[PDB]
């Protein structure tokens, strides 16, 4: 719809996974190596509910990109896909609220 700078990816994770040490770190790795396949990624932020401390909303990860170009080509392949068995909703996020960390 419109490229900004940051790329958001939700409906692809669950608190039942972002609650373990190796499990949570697992997604962080795959998600990082994946986003860094179309271009360069500044960083990534993933929720980590402490024994269910941040479950409320948990399940939404985002990635800080460097160039909107590789960002476009990024979701152009990981959109509507399946991180495991569910569709992944990708929505271009703005560096504004992103840094605001309105999520976690």
């Amino acid at each position: 719809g419109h490229p900004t700078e940051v790329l958001c990816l939700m409906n692809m994770v669950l608190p039942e996974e972002l609650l373990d040490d190796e499990e949570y770190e697992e997604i962080v790795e795959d998600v990082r190596d994946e986003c860094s396949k179309y271009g360069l990624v500044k960083s990534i932020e993933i929720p980590r509910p402490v024994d269910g401390v941040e479950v409320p909303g948990c399940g939404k990860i985002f990635v800080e990109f460097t160039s909107v170009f590789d960002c476009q080509k990024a979701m152009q392949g990981l959109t509507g896909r399946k991180f495991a068995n569910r569709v992944v909703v990708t929505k271009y996020c703005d560096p504004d609220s992103y840094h605001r960390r309105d999520f976690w």
Partner: peptide
């Protein structure tokens, strides 16, 4: 890459 689990993300297209 990875450590225990295998890579099986994005499966549709």
């Amino acid at each position: 890459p990875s450590k225990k689990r295998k890579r099986s993300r994005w499966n549709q297209d």
